[PDB]
Design a protein around this nucleic acid. Sequence first.
DNA 1: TAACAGTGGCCTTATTAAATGACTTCTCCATGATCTAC
RNA 2: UUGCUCAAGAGAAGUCAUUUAAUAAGGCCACUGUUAAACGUAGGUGAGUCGUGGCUUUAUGCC
Lengths: 109, 109, 288, 285
Amino acid sequence: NSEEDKQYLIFIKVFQQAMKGNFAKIYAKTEEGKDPPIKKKVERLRAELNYCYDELSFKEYLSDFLVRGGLNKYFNEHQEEIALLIKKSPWQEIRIWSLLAIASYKPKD
Amino acid sequence: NSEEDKQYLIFIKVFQQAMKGNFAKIYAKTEEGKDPPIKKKVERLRAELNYCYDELSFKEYLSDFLVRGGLNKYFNEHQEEIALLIKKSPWQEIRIWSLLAIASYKPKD
Amino acid sequence: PNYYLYGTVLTRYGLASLNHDIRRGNKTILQKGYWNNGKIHSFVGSSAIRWALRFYLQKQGYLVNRVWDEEEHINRLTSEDFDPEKFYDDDIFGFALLESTPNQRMGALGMNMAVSLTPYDGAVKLGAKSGREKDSTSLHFTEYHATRYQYYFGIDATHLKDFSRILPMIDGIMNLPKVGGSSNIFNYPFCPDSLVFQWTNHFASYISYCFEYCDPKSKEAKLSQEFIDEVECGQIDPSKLWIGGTIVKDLQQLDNFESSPLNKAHIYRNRNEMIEALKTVIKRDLGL
Amino acid sequence: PNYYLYGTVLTRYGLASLNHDIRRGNKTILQKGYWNNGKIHSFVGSSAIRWALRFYLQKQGYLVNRVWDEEEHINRLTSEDFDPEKFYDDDIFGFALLPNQRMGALGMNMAVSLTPYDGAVKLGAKSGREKDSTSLHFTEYHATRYQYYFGIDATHLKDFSRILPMIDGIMNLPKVGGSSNIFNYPFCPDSLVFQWTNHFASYISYCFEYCDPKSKEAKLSQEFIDEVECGQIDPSKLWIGGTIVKDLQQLDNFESSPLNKAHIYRNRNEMIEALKTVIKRDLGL
DNA sequence: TAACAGTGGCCTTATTAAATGACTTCTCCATGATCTAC
RNA sequence: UUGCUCAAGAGAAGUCAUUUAAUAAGGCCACUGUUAAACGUAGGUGAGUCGUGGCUUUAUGCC
């Protein structure tokens, strides 16, 4: 319930879809008998998330991550809501939401 | 409300229209039974957006991109204010908005 | 009397990666935070400058309780009991022996963190272990910053066990060794290029951070309008103000400089001459 | 006649780590709490400023019962029996035996940072090799200006002339207790709002306010300005000095405003001299 | 088109966790012998 | 008209006077984003002010 909670939940879904896309890209990148990453890529994503300062850097990185995720239906249905949510809101809160999405993305894969 | 986000939203809309027009132009460019990529087009657009180094770069880039966007109606009734928005505001904010528009573009086609 | 030497020194323009933060991942980040106008500036810790001053005191002879080994990168104490009367470093920087003559000392030098004059925008340098083989320790990133640095210090001269030890401290501030950082790839000389010193006998300073930028992405540096207003309004006695360095040219190019009260301050373009005059005044006042 | 000197002073901009709270684990916790807008603001305790004033009095003659040794870092009492008639310290700051207990002619409130405290953590390591439990530590700083409010009951002083050294000390405050070695923060004021009135009603407490999160412009106020305009706080009893004068004189219709006829000096020393002249005239010194 | 996404070591060392003195003040009783007035 | 009918626990009182979380500390040392390439051949436009002045034949163009 509540509009803010619904927007937050479906933004979590958006971020989880983006991480699925990025992890699939990493899977396609690696070849041969080398083990593709599962967990240390999540650690890399965490390190890149905490490497953030000011509003500009984090929003740039988040937008780049979302685009690199590729196709995503949750952002498809909700353009205005997530565009406003990302453009507005403190960047630290959005980082908290992104980390919460990271910690609960894995049931998909 | 607070027409700043109105300008943000119609900027996203005209950016999506322009990228749709450029993808249509690419579809015209390709030929024969080769499948015209769609995800690779988005990847190329993101890479070109990240290729810029402030002010001159990415400003003439995005103006040229919008020009090749073609007959964009929302551009036509929103020439002057979008030009003012582009002339003002930091360029990295414009890049963030463009990346968000790319991430939320698909349901058009 | 209670004489204090306050001062703000501005470094030279260059690529700096001096003080870093927690290791994080593969990218070494600078120590940065909000400084002015809500913009993020890069900082150099005052402990780094204190370590550099200690190293200067050690290199130029002198008696220092802490001896930097410089070979095994270890710190050795010549005497386990701190003696501010004998050792320069104990007298100047103080000490604190907590494990269980007084065991603690307040030190005669008080520094503040060096603040980059320019906001820190981007400036991450890609680094590779090279070769054809690749491993975890192959791709790394290092943050740098093309800016001047500016820090504020104050000396309680009367607090010194030996009043003459202030002179080596001024010499060290002038010829400062490398301030802790990645000098292999980012060699940043921390020697001053502009000085605003005040040799007064009261606690108020009003010269904390007198340097401000123009065209926020440029190397040009100017005295802040607040500092000039402070000098002109009547506060900050010009006879106690020592200004030296490359800022002297800009100060003299100002209009109505001759009629300004700032003209009555001790202004020397050559830093050595300014330091010599200031040390003459200090020796006269302290009875050295 | 009862005479009171209320004042709110604003410090210069700089990095401050003055009042570490409790040392939570590895971090020296800068003292902070909620303030104004529900944001966390760093604080400097009033006892620190009182200690700084005591040190100022000790350093320049001014017989004081408590003597800060400055070498053994201990306090020595010249007379075990407090005598406010002889010592500046007992007369001004009071005492308590646990007698007479005084009451204290100087009342001070905690200094409050003009800006919210975001995270401002500084890392600290000890050289290299042979690393132990003390090798790694963190320290919390704050790059803002501090602002505190004090009140003096001049008539309560045993010797009326002792108010002048207190003003001199407030304007020439020594090191206010804190990490001076690493974060040297001068506590001398760059903006003052003093009120020398004769009734126990002050509306200048914490007048300075700017918010504008991370900045240092430090505009005076809107509620204090409205208080001056409305009719109370007569400008004849108001003394404003410091860098705030430049912003005040640049306001529109300032000449027609009642704030114009207040004692406004850009130079702090000039305003202090005029105020001390008025105080000496009023107190019969 | 590729391969990497840091390798280390620490995550506080002391010290003191209250010192005084007060710990309600008044009043409102119940009942029978006796005095006294009718 | 009810073991009832009537029925103020009421008046007064500052938790006070005094206290620096202080003294000390380099996130440090090392790292090439190495190596190779024919441009082959065909993708377009957004916006004022008002009655002769120095040359030149009015002409008609220059400043």
